[PDB]
Amino acid sequence: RIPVVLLACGSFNPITNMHLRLFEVARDHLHQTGRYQVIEGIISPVNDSYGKKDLVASHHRVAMARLALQTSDWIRVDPWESEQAQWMETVKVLRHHHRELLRSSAQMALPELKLLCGADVLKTFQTPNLWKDTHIQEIVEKFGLVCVSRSGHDPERYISDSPILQQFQHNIHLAREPVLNEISATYVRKALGQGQSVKYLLPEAVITYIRDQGLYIN
Amino acid sequence: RIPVVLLACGSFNPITNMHLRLFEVARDHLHQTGRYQVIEGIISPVNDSYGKKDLVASHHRVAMARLALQTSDWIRVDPWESEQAQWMETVKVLRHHHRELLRSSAQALPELKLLCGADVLKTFQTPNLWKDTHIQEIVEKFGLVCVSRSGHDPERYISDSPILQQFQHNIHLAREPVLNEISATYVRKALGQGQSVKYLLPEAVITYIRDQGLYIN
Protein backbone atom coordinates (compact mmCIF):
# COMPACT_ATOMS: atom_id res chain seq x y z
CA ARG A 1 0.00 0.00 0.00
CA ILE A 2 2.70 2.44 1.08
CA PRO A 3 5.09 3.11 -1.83
CA VAL A 4 8.66 2.70 -0.58
CA VAL A 5 12.16 3.36 -1.93
CA LEU A 6 15.15 1.29 -0.77
CA LEU A 7 18.45 3.17 -0.40
CA ALA A 8 21.71 1.25 0.05
CA CYS A 9 24.75 3.18 1.25
CA GLY A 10 28.22 1.67 1.41
CA SER A 11 31.61 1.66 -0.26
CA PHE A 12 30.67 -0.73 -3.12
CA ASN A 13 34.37 -1.44 -3.51
CA PRO A 14 33.50 -3.35 -5.67
CA ILE A 15 29.80 -4.17 -5.82
CA THR A 16 29.17 -7.94 -5.58
CA ASN A 17 26.32 -10.41 -6.08
CA MET A 18 25.66 -10.07 -2.33
CA HIS A 19 24.65 -6.38 -2.60
CA LEU A 20 22.24 -7.06 -5.49
CA ARG A 21 20.69 -10.05 -3.74
CA LEU A 22 20.04 -7.83 -0.69
CA PHE A 23 17.73 -5.60 -2.76
CA GLU A 24 15.82 -8.60 -4.12
CA VAL A 25 15.29 -10.19 -0.68
CA ALA A 26 14.26 -6.87 0.87
CA ARG A 27 11.71 -6.12 -1.86
CA ASP A 28 10.20 -9.61 -1.53
CA HIS A 29 9.93 -9.19 2.25
CA LEU A 30 8.22 -5.79 2.12
CA HIS A 31 5.82 -7.04 -0.54
CA GLN A 32 5.17 -10.16 1.56
CA THR A 33 3.96 -8.07 4.52
CA GLY A 34 1.16 -6.76 2.26
CA ARG A 35 1.52 -3.12 3.33
CA TYR A 36 4.26 -1.88 0.98
CA GLN A 37 4.84 -1.43 -2.74
CA VAL A 38 8.55 -1.15 -3.52
CA ILE A 39 8.92 1.45 -6.27
CA GLU A 40 12.67 1.79 -6.69
CA GLY A 41 16.09 0.84 -5.39
CA ILE A 42 19.01 3.25 -5.09
CA ILE A 43 22.68 2.30 -4.77
CA SER A 44 24.67 5.21 -3.33
CA PRO A 45 28.45 4.71 -3.29
CA VAL A 46 30.39 6.42 -0.52
CA ASN A 47 32.24 9.70 -1.04
CA ASP A 48 36.03 9.58 -1.45
CA SER A 49 36.53 12.19 1.34
CA TYR A 50 38.83 10.76 4.05
CA GLY A 51 38.45 7.33 2.46
CA LYS A 52 40.49 4.21 3.26
CA LYS A 53 43.63 3.57 1.25
CA ASP A 54 41.92 0.57 -0.46
CA LEU A 55 38.94 2.66 -1.60
CA VAL A 56 39.20 3.12 -5.35
CA ALA A 57 38.09 6.39 -6.91
CA SER A 58 34.36 7.00 -6.78
CA HIS A 59 33.90 7.24 -10.57
CA HIS A 60 35.12 3.63 -10.84
CA ARG A 61 32.71 2.43 -8.15
CA VAL A 62 29.83 4.28 -9.81
CA ALA A 63 30.79 2.78 -13.20
CA MET A 64 30.98 -0.75 -11.76
CA ALA A 65 27.63 -0.36 -10.02
CA ARG A 66 26.12 0.86 -13.32
CA LEU A 67 27.51 -2.18 -15.18
CA ALA A 68 26.22 -4.46 -12.42
CA LEU A 69 22.71 -3.03 -12.73
CA GLN A 70 22.20 -3.22 -16.49
CA THR A 71 20.10 -6.38 -15.97
CA SER A 72 17.94 -4.70 -13.29
CA ASP A 73 14.65 -3.05 -14.11
CA TRP A 74 14.19 -1.34 -10.72
CA ILE A 75 17.59 -0.55 -9.07
CA ARG A 76 19.71 2.41 -10.19
CA VAL A 77 22.96 3.96 -9.06
CA ASP A 78 22.82 7.56 -7.85
CA PRO A 79 26.24 9.25 -7.70
CA TRP A 80 25.00 12.32 -5.74
CA GLU A 81 26.58 11.29 -2.42
CA SER A 82 29.91 10.61 -4.17
CA GLU A 83 29.77 13.91 -6.07
CA GLN A 84 29.54 16.08 -2.96
CA ALA A 85 32.54 18.24 -2.09
CA GLN A 86 32.76 17.08 1.55
CA TRP A 87 32.45 14.20 3.96
CA MET A 88 28.85 12.94 3.86
CA GLU A 89 26.85 11.45 6.73
CA THR A 90 24.35 8.72 5.81
CA VAL A 91 21.48 10.59 7.47
CA LYS A 92 22.03 13.52 5.08
CA VAL A 93 21.99 11.17 2.09
CA LEU A 94 18.63 9.83 3.31
CA ARG A 95 17.32 13.39 3.76
CA HIS A 96 18.35 14.34 0.22
CA HIS A 97 16.79 11.32 -1.46
CA HIS A 98 13.68 11.61 0.71
CA ARG A 99 13.19 15.21 -0.45
CA GLU A 100 13.66 14.25 -4.08
CA LEU A 101 11.20 11.36 -3.58
CA LEU A 102 8.52 13.66 -2.18
CA ARG A 103 9.15 16.00 -5.14
CA SER A 104 8.99 13.31 -7.81
CA SER A 105 5.87 11.73 -6.30
CA ALA A 106 3.91 15.00 -6.47
CA GLN A 107 4.26 14.92 -10.27
CA MET A 108 2.82 11.42 -10.76
CA ALA A 109 -0.36 7.25 0.62
CA LEU A 110 2.88 9.27 0.57
CA PRO A 111 6.10 7.37 -0.21
CA GLU A 112 8.66 6.31 2.37
CA LEU A 113 12.44 6.02 2.12
CA LYS A 114 14.14 3.20 4.00
CA LEU A 115 17.81 2.31 4.49
CA LEU A 116 18.75 -1.18 3.29
CA CYS A 117 21.55 -2.87 5.19
CA GLY A 118 22.83 -6.17 6.47
CA ALA A 119 21.88 -7.29 9.96
CA ASP A 120 25.46 -6.57 11.07
CA VAL A 121 24.70 -2.84 10.86
CA LEU A 122 22.41 -3.24 13.88
CA LYS A 123 25.56 -4.01 15.87
CA THR A 124 28.01 -1.85 13.93
CA PHE A 125 26.12 1.32 12.89
CA GLN A 126 28.50 1.68 9.93
CA THR A 127 27.26 2.22 6.35
CA PRO A 128 30.23 2.24 5.83
CA ASN A 129 31.23 4.89 8.41
CA LEU A 130 30.28 5.00 12.07
CA TRP A 131 27.12 7.10 12.49
CA LYS A 132 27.10 9.93 14.97
CA ASP A 133 25.24 9.14 18.20
CA THR A 134 22.87 12.08 17.61
CA HIS A 135 21.87 10.78 14.15
CA ILE A 136 20.96 7.17 14.99
CA GLN A 137 17.52 8.11 16.31
CA GLU A 138 16.63 10.03 13.15
CA ILE A 139 17.70 7.19 10.85
CA VAL A 140 15.72 4.50 12.65
CA GLU A 141 12.79 6.82 13.48
CA LYS A 142 12.05 8.97 10.43
CA PHE A 143 13.28 6.53 7.76
CA GLY A 144 13.68 3.03 9.16
CA LEU A 145 15.86 0.00 8.48
CA VAL A 146 15.28 -3.01 6.23
CA CYS A 147 17.80 -5.59 7.45
CA VAL A 148 18.74 -8.80 5.63
CA SER A 149 20.62 -11.30 7.78
CA ARG A 150 23.73 -13.18 6.73
CA SER A 151 24.65 -16.47 8.37
CA GLY A 152 25.95 -15.83 11.87
CA HIS A 153 24.02 -12.56 12.24
CA ASP A 154 21.57 -12.30 15.14
CA PRO A 155 19.45 -9.17 14.68
CA GLU A 156 17.13 -9.70 17.66
CA ARG A 157 20.03 -9.84 20.11
CA TYR A 158 21.52 -6.75 18.47
CA ILE A 159 18.20 -4.95 18.98
CA SER A 160 18.06 -6.21 22.57
CA ASP A 161 21.56 -4.87 23.32
CA SER A 162 20.67 -1.34 22.07
CA PRO A 163 18.12 0.95 23.78
CA ILE A 164 17.65 3.24 20.76
CA LEU A 165 16.97 0.29 18.44
CA GLN A 166 14.61 -1.30 20.96
CA GLN A 167 12.84 2.05 21.45
CA PHE A 168 11.87 2.25 17.78
CA GLN A 169 12.07 -1.41 16.70
CA HIS A 170 8.71 -0.95 14.97
CA ASN A 171 10.56 0.74 12.08
CA ILE A 172 13.15 -2.06 11.70
CA HIS A 173 12.07 -4.72 9.18
CA LEU A 174 13.91 -8.03 9.51
CA ALA A 175 13.77 -9.98 6.26
CA ARG A 176 13.47 -13.72 6.82
CA GLU A 177 15.01 -15.19 3.69
CA PRO A 178 18.75 -15.98 3.77
CA VAL A 179 21.23 -13.95 1.72
CA LEU A 180 23.06 -17.11 0.48
CA ASN A 181 25.48 -14.86 -1.50
CA GLU A 182 27.93 -14.53 1.42
CA ILE A 183 30.27 -12.35 -0.63
CA SER A 184 32.06 -9.44 1.02
CA ALA A 185 33.88 -6.88 -1.08
CA THR A 186 36.91 -7.51 1.18
CA TYR A 187 37.12 -11.11 0.01
CA VAL A 188 36.81 -10.07 -3.64
CA ARG A 189 39.63 -7.53 -3.27
CA LYS A 190 41.88 -10.09 -1.58
CA ALA A 191 41.13 -12.71 -4.23
CA LEU A 192 41.75 -10.25 -7.06
CA GLY A 193 45.03 -9.21 -5.49
CA GLN A 194 46.14 -12.84 -5.30
CA GLY A 195 45.10 -13.71 -8.87
CA GLN A 196 42.30 -15.99 -7.73
CA SER A 197 39.02 -16.41 -9.55
CA VAL A 198 36.05 -14.28 -8.57
CA LYS A 199 33.85 -15.48 -11.44
CA TYR A 200 30.19 -15.99 -10.39
CA LEU A 201 30.77 -13.78 -7.29
CA LEU A 202 30.06 -10.55 -9.20
CA PRO A 203 28.64 -9.78 -12.64
CA GLU A 204 30.95 -10.53 -15.56
CA ALA A 205 30.85 -6.93 -16.81
CA VAL A 206 32.26 -5.74 -13.46
CA ILE A 207 35.08 -8.33 -13.71
CA THR A 208 35.87 -7.11 -17.22
CA TYR A 209 35.89 -3.47 -16.07
CA ILE A 210 38.19 -4.36 -13.17
CA ARG A 211 40.69 -6.09 -15.47
CA ASP A 212 40.59 -3.39 -18.16
CA GLN A 213 41.09 -0.61 -15.61
CA GLY A 214 43.73 -2.51 -13.62
CA LEU A 215 41.89 -2.18 -10.31
CA TYR A 216 42.66 -4.15 -7.14
CA ILE A 217 46.12 -5.39 -8.22
CA ASN A 218 48.85 -4.72 -5.65
CA ARG B 1 52.90 -30.93 -14.63
CA ILE B 2 50.02 -33.37 -15.11
CA PRO B 3 46.85 -32.47 -17.04
CA VAL B 4 43.62 -32.86 -15.07
CA VAL B 5 39.94 -32.91 -16.00
CA LEU B 6 37.32 -32.12 -13.34
CA LEU B 7 33.99 -33.99 -13.50
CA ALA B 8 30.87 -32.96 -11.56
CA CYS B 9 27.95 -35.39 -11.45
CA GLY B 10 24.65 -34.31 -9.99
CA SER B 11 21.02 -33.46 -10.56
CA PHE B 12 21.66 -29.81 -11.63
CA ASN B 13 18.00 -29.16 -10.99
CA PRO B 14 18.68 -26.31 -11.73
CA ILE B 15 22.32 -25.42 -12.05
CA THR B 16 23.18 -22.45 -9.78
CA ASN B 17 26.10 -20.07 -9.22
CA MET B 18 27.24 -22.50 -6.47
CA HIS B 19 28.02 -25.28 -8.99
CA LEU B 20 30.04 -22.97 -11.27
CA ARG B 21 31.91 -21.44 -8.33
CA LEU B 22 32.90 -24.97 -7.22
CA PHE B 23 34.77 -25.50 -10.50
CA GLU B 24 36.61 -22.19 -10.24
CA VAL B 25 37.72 -22.84 -6.66
CA ALA B 26 38.81 -26.41 -7.47
CA ARG B 27 40.89 -25.30 -10.46
CA ASP B 28 42.62 -22.58 -8.43
CA HIS B 29 43.42 -25.15 -5.71
CA LEU B 30 44.93 -27.70 -8.09
CA HIS B 31 46.95 -25.05 -9.92
CA GLN B 32 48.23 -23.75 -6.56
CA THR B 33 49.58 -27.20 -5.58
CA GLY B 34 52.08 -26.84 -8.45
CA ARG B 35 51.63 -30.41 -9.72
CA TYR B 36 48.52 -30.09 -11.93
CA GLN B 37 47.35 -28.34 -15.10
CA VAL B 38 43.55 -28.23 -15.24
CA ILE B 39 42.53 -28.42 -18.89
CA GLU B 40 38.77 -28.99 -18.73
CA GLY B 41 35.68 -29.19 -16.56
CA ILE B 42 32.73 -31.48 -17.28
CA ILE B 43 29.19 -31.08 -15.96
CA SER B 44 27.23 -34.35 -16.27
CA PRO B 45 23.57 -34.14 -15.23
CA VAL B 46 21.98 -37.30 -13.85
CA ASN B 47 19.73 -39.58 -15.89
CA ASP B 48 15.97 -39.27 -15.41
CA SER B 49 15.78 -42.98 -14.40
CA TYR B 50 17.03 -41.73 -11.01
CA GLY B 51 13.70 -39.96 -10.97
CA LYS B 52 12.51 -38.12 -7.91
CA LYS B 53 9.20 -36.33 -8.41
CA ASP B 54 10.71 -32.84 -8.67
CA LEU B 55 13.49 -33.90 -11.09
CA VAL B 56 12.86 -31.88 -14.26
CA ALA B 57 13.46 -33.65 -17.58
CA SER B 58 17.14 -34.08 -18.43
CA HIS B 59 16.68 -32.22 -21.71
CA HIS B 60 15.89 -29.09 -19.68
CA ARG B 61 18.68 -29.65 -17.13
CA VAL B 62 21.37 -29.96 -19.80
CA ALA B 63 19.84 -27.04 -21.73
CA MET B 64 20.09 -24.88 -18.59
CA ALA B 65 23.64 -26.04 -17.91
CA ARG B 66 24.62 -25.22 -21.51
CA LEU B 67 23.11 -21.72 -21.16
CA ALA B 68 24.92 -21.28 -17.83
CA LEU B 69 28.24 -22.23 -19.44
CA GLN B 70 28.12 -19.68 -22.28
CA THR B 71 30.59 -17.44 -20.45
CA SER B 72 33.00 -20.26 -19.50
CA ASP B 73 36.02 -20.92 -21.67
CA TRP B 74 36.88 -24.25 -19.97
CA ILE B 75 33.75 -26.00 -18.53
CA ARG B 76 31.38 -27.91 -20.82
CA VAL B 77 28.19 -29.89 -20.30
CA ASP B 78 28.31 -33.52 -21.44
CA PRO B 79 24.85 -35.13 -21.80
CA TRP B 80 26.22 -38.69 -22.33
CA GLU B 81 25.15 -39.86 -18.85
CA SER B 82 21.64 -38.44 -19.20
CA GLU B 83 21.24 -40.06 -22.65
CA GLN B 84 21.85 -43.63 -21.45
CA ALA B 85 18.85 -45.93 -21.12
CA GLN B 86 19.42 -46.35 -17.38
CA TRP B 87 20.78 -44.50 -14.38
CA MET B 88 24.49 -45.17 -13.83
CA GLU B 89 26.64 -45.18 -10.72
CA THR B 90 29.11 -42.30 -10.59
CA VAL B 91 32.09 -44.61 -11.04
CA LYS B 92 30.83 -45.77 -14.44
CA VAL B 93 30.57 -42.13 -15.54
CA LEU B 94 34.17 -41.59 -14.41
CA ARG B 95 35.25 -44.71 -16.36
CA HIS B 96 33.52 -43.43 -19.51
CA HIS B 97 34.98 -39.94 -19.40
CA HIS B 98 38.44 -41.24 -18.47
CA ARG B 99 38.38 -43.40 -21.59
CA GLU B 100 37.34 -40.36 -23.64
CA LEU B 101 40.20 -38.39 -22.05
CA LEU B 102 42.79 -41.05 -22.91
CA ARG B 103 41.46 -41.31 -26.48
CA SER B 104 41.81 -37.57 -27.15
CA SER B 105 45.55 -38.46 -26.87
CA ALA B 106 47.91 -36.88 -24.36
CA GLN B 107 50.22 -33.85 -24.43
CA ALA B 108 52.58 -38.63 -17.88
CA LEU B 109 48.88 -39.81 -18.34
CA PRO B 110 46.06 -37.25 -17.88
CA GLU B 111 43.99 -37.63 -14.72
CA LEU B 112 40.24 -37.34 -14.17
CA LYS B 113 39.04 -36.27 -10.73
CA LEU B 114 35.55 -36.04 -9.24
CA LEU B 115 34.53 -32.57 -8.08
CA CYS B 116 32.20 -32.40 -5.09
CA GLY B 117 31.14 -30.31 -2.16
CA ALA B 118 31.63 -31.54 1.38
CA ASP B 119 27.98 -32.66 1.57
CA VAL B 120 28.60 -35.31 -1.11
CA LEU B 121 31.83 -36.32 0.62
CA LYS B 122 29.63 -36.92 3.66
CA THR B 123 27.58 -39.35 1.56
CA PHE B 124 30.74 -41.35 0.79
CA GLN B 125 31.49 -42.21 4.45
CA THR B 126 28.28 -43.49 6.03
CA PRO B 127 28.85 -46.88 7.66
CA ASN B 128 27.12 -48.86 4.88
CA LEU B 129 29.93 -47.79 2.52
CA TRP B 130 33.03 -48.57 4.61
CA LYS B 131 33.83 -51.61 2.43
CA ASP B 132 32.15 -50.47 -0.79
CA THR B 133 34.26 -51.29 -3.86
CA HIS B 134 32.83 -48.44 -5.98
CA ILE B 135 33.76 -45.80 -3.38
CA GLN B 136 37.23 -47.32 -3.30
CA GLU B 137 37.54 -47.20 -7.08
CA ILE B 138 36.51 -43.53 -7.03
CA VAL B 139 39.16 -42.48 -4.54
CA GLU B 140 41.89 -44.94 -5.61
CA LYS B 141 41.70 -44.74 -9.42
CA PHE B 142 40.32 -41.22 -9.94
CA GLY B 143 40.48 -39.08 -6.81
CA LEU B 144 38.36 -36.29 -5.38
CA VAL B 145 38.52 -32.52 -5.28
CA CYS B 146 36.39 -31.32 -2.37
CA VAL B 147 35.25 -27.71 -1.94
CA SER B 148 34.22 -26.96 1.61
CA ARG B 149 30.63 -25.98 2.32
CA SER B 150 30.20 -23.94 5.51
CA GLY B 151 29.26 -26.21 8.40
CA HIS B 152 30.93 -29.40 7.12
CA ASP B 153 34.11 -31.08 8.37
CA PRO B 154 35.76 -32.89 5.45
CA GLU B 155 38.79 -34.05 7.47
CA ARG B 156 36.55 -35.98 9.88
CA TYR B 157 34.59 -37.52 6.98
CA ILE B 158 37.93 -38.69 5.57
CA SER B 159 39.01 -40.11 8.92
CA ASP B 160 35.69 -41.89 9.61
CA SER B 161 35.82 -44.14 6.52
CA PRO B 162 38.63 -46.74 6.27
CA ILE B 163 38.50 -46.41 2.48
CA LEU B 164 38.76 -42.62 2.49
CA GLN B 165 41.47 -42.83 5.16
CA GLN B 166 43.55 -45.29 3.11
CA PHE B 167 43.39 -43.14 -0.03
CA GLN B 168 43.45 -39.70 1.64
CA HIS B 169 46.38 -38.72 -0.60
CA ASN B 170 44.06 -38.64 -3.63
CA ILE B 171 41.47 -36.48 -1.81
CA HIS B 172 42.22 -32.78 -2.41
CA LEU B 173 40.67 -30.30 0.03
CA ALA B 174 40.27 -26.81 -1.42
CA ARG B 175 40.87 -24.12 1.18
CA GLU B 176 38.86 -21.20 -0.27
CA PRO B 177 35.27 -20.85 1.00
CA VAL B 178 32.58 -21.38 -1.59
CA LEU B 179 30.64 -18.20 -0.55
CA ASN B 180 27.86 -19.09 -3.05
CA GLU B 181 26.03 -21.21 -0.47
CA ILE B 182 23.10 -21.86 -2.82
CA SER B 183 21.24 -25.16 -3.00
CA ALA B 184 19.04 -26.15 -5.92
CA THR B 185 16.43 -27.10 -3.30
CA TYR B 186 16.27 -23.50 -2.09
CA VAL B 187 16.00 -22.25 -5.67
CA ARG B 188 13.09 -24.57 -6.47
CA LYS B 189 11.28 -23.61 -3.28
CA ALA B 190 11.72 -19.89 -4.02
CA LEU B 191 10.54 -20.28 -7.62
CA GLY B 192 7.44 -22.16 -6.46
CA GLN B 193 6.63 -19.29 -4.09
CA GLY B 194 7.19 -16.55 -6.66
CA GLN B 195 10.28 -15.26 -4.85
CA SER B 196 13.34 -13.83 -6.58
CA VAL B 197 16.32 -16.02 -7.40
CA LYS B 198 18.09 -13.24 -9.28
CA TYR B 199 21.87 -13.14 -8.63
CA LEU B 200 21.68 -16.78 -7.42
CA LEU B 201 21.67 -18.25 -10.97
CA PRO B 202 22.88 -17.12 -14.39
CA GLU B 203 20.37 -14.76 -15.97
CA ALA B 204 19.92 -16.94 -19.05
CA VAL B 205 18.95 -19.83 -16.74
CA ILE B 206 16.27 -17.72 -15.03
CA THR B 207 15.03 -16.68 -18.47
CA TYR B 208 14.88 -20.30 -19.63
CA ILE B 209 12.98 -21.29 -16.46
CA ARG B 210 10.49 -18.44 -16.93
CA ASP B 211 9.99 -19.19 -20.66
CA GLN B 212 9.54 -22.95 -20.09
CA GLY B 213 7.31 -22.62 -17.03
CA LEU B 214 9.61 -24.80 -14.92
CA TYR B 215 9.45 -25.20 -11.12
CA ILE B 216 6.00 -23.57 -10.90
CA ASN B 217 3.34 -25.08 -8.65
Author numbering:
A (entry chain B): 4 to 111, 125 to 234
B (entry chain A): 4 to 110, 125 to 234
Manuscript text:
Nicotinamide mononucleotide adenylyltransferase (NMNAT) was initially identified as an NAD+ synthase that catalyzes the reversible conversion of NMN (nicotinamide mononucleotide) to NAD+ in the final step of both the de novo biosynthesis and salvage pathways in most organisms across all three kingdoms of life. Intriguingly, in addition to the well-studied NAD+ synthase activity, NMNAT has been found to be able to retrieve the activity of luciferase from heat-denatured amorphous aggregation suggesting a chaperone-like activity of NMNAT. By combining multiple biophysical and computational approaches, we reveal the molecular mechanism of NMNAT as a specific chaperone of pTau. Taken together, these results indicate that NMNAT adopts a conserved pocket to bind both the enzymatic substrates and pTau.
Alternatively, we used mN3, which shares high sequence similarity to hN2 and is more stable. To identify the binding site of mN3 for pTau, we firstly determined the atomic structure of mN3 at the resolution of 2.0 Å by X-ray crystallography. The structure of mN3 monomer is similar to that of hN3 with an r.m.s.d. value of 0.543 Å between Cα atoms. The catalytic pocket that synthesizes NAD+ from NMN and ATP is highly conserved in the NMNAT family. The crystal contains two mN3 molecules forming a homo-dimer with a buried surface area of 1,075.8 Å2 in the asymmetric unit. Consistently, size exclusion chromatography and multi-angle laser light scattering (SEC-MALS) characterized that mN3 forms a dimer (~64 kDa) in solution, and as the mN3 concentration decreased, no significant dissociation of the dimer was observed. The entrance of the enzymatic pocket features a positively-charged patch mainly composed of residues K55, K56, R205 and K206 for the NMN and ATP binding. Lysine residues, K95, K139, and K206, that are involved in the cross-linking of mN3 with pK19, cluster around the entrance of the enzymatic pocket of mN3. The complex structural model showed that the phosphorylated segment is well accommodated in the ATP/NMN-binding pocket of mN3.
